[PDB]
Amino acid sequence: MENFQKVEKIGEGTYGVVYKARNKLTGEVVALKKIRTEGVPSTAIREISLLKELNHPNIVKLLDVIHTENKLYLVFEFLHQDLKKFMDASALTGIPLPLIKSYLFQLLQGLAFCHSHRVLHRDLKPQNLLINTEGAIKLADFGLARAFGVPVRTYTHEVVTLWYRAPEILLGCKYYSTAVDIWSLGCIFAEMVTRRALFPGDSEIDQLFRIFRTLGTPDEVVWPGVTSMPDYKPSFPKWARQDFSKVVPPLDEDGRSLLSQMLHYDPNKRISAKAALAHPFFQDVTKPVPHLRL
Numbered sequence: 376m377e378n379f380q381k382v383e384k385i386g387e388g389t390y391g392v393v394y395k396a397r398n399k400l401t402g403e404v405v406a407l408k409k410i411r412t413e414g415v416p417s418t419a420i421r422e423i424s425l426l427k428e429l430n431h432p433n434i435v436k437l438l439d440v441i442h443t444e445n446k447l448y449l450v451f452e453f454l455h456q457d458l459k460k461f462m463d464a465s466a467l468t469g470i471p472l473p474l475i476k477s478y479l480f481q482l483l484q485g486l487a488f489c490h491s492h493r494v495l496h497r498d499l500k501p502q503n504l505l506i507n508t509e510g511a512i513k514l515a516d517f518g519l520a521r522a523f524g525v526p527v528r529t530y531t532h533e534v535v536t537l538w539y540r541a542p543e544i545l546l547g548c549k550y551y552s553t554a555v556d557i558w559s560l561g562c563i564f565a566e567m568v569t570r571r572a573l574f575p576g577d578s579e580i581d582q583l584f585r586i587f588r589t590l591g592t593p594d595e596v597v598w599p600g601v602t603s604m605p606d607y608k609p610s611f612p613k614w615a616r617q618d619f620s621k622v623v624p625p626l627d628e629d630g631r632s633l634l635s636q637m638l639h640y641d642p643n644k645r646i647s648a649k650a651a652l653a654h655p656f657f658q659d660v661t662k663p664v665p666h667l668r669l
């Protein structure tokens with residue numbers, strides 16, 4: 376629209392295409408997301424509108440929600456790179472542990488803030504974690520999932536990544552809790568450390584079984600209530616749990632301890648963002664400057 380100036384097509388997300396754009400009057404450079412199909416549910420507009428007040432240094436700011444011409448555009452603060460691209464760029468050498476720790480700590484502060492305001496992300500992945508030259512990392516798209524359900528293909532035939540999905544979602548639990556975000560962040564923490572996705576499933580059952588093959592097939596002992604979950608099948612193969620020392624080497628025991636608490640099967644036992652911030656792993660946390668080529 377005439378209020379902007381499409382610089383580039385940042386890409387295509389699970390909701391629609393995103394453009395980098397400049398406000399013609401303010402000169403502000405922003406990310407503009409064109410949301411995907413009828414008359415835009417009023418329920419969704421109120422929900423989304425509430426997110427304009429969810430402001431925190433580690434949350435990508437939602438600047439405006441435009442519902443005009445019966446269309447919905449979300450205007451977000453712009454950051455130049457995402458964690459998926461940074462991890463790929465850092466693949467040869469790996470992201471230094473101090474920076475992995477800083478990013479994890481900042482992401483947990485972001486989740487702690489959102490969760491205390493009863494807002495869930497539900498679809499965290501490296502691509503929606505944005506970084507800047509100052510060493511900051513921010514969570515993008517918080518709250519969009521609620522009042523927008525779970526999609527299999529973005530807006531036009533594009534495979535939804537299941538790699539970071541918590542087991543309770545995969546087993547059909549309808550009532551997601553803040554624990555799903557801690558699970559996703561744990562998967563991302565492991566990926567930053569090993570430089571390979573932890574559970575790269577290519578189907579819902581492949582995702583579940585990859586989790587079971589690593590963490591053991593869950594049972595009533597470790598996860599009370601699991602055998603009564605909607606999609607649980609007594610026929611699931613029974614795999615033994617592997618040791619974390621083989622899962623994310625050469626991460627130290629502080630890191631393995633924290634990761635193990637972020638990947639507990641029982642969402643009720645899984646560590647909260649607030650409690651994770653107090654974990655000994657963060658005793659020596661700092662805020663390094665990443666090497667960014669833009």
Ligand SMILES: NC(=O)c1cc([N+](=O)[O-])ccc1NCc1ccc(S(N)(=O)=O)cc1
Nearest residue numbers: 385388393406408451452453454455456457
């Ligand atoms: N708020 C955002 O800034 C931003 C928003 C979305 N989004 O809504 O889907 C995606 C990436 C973003 N930044 C990271 C980003 C920006 C530009 C490139 S590009 N076009 O130079 O490759 C890549 C990644």
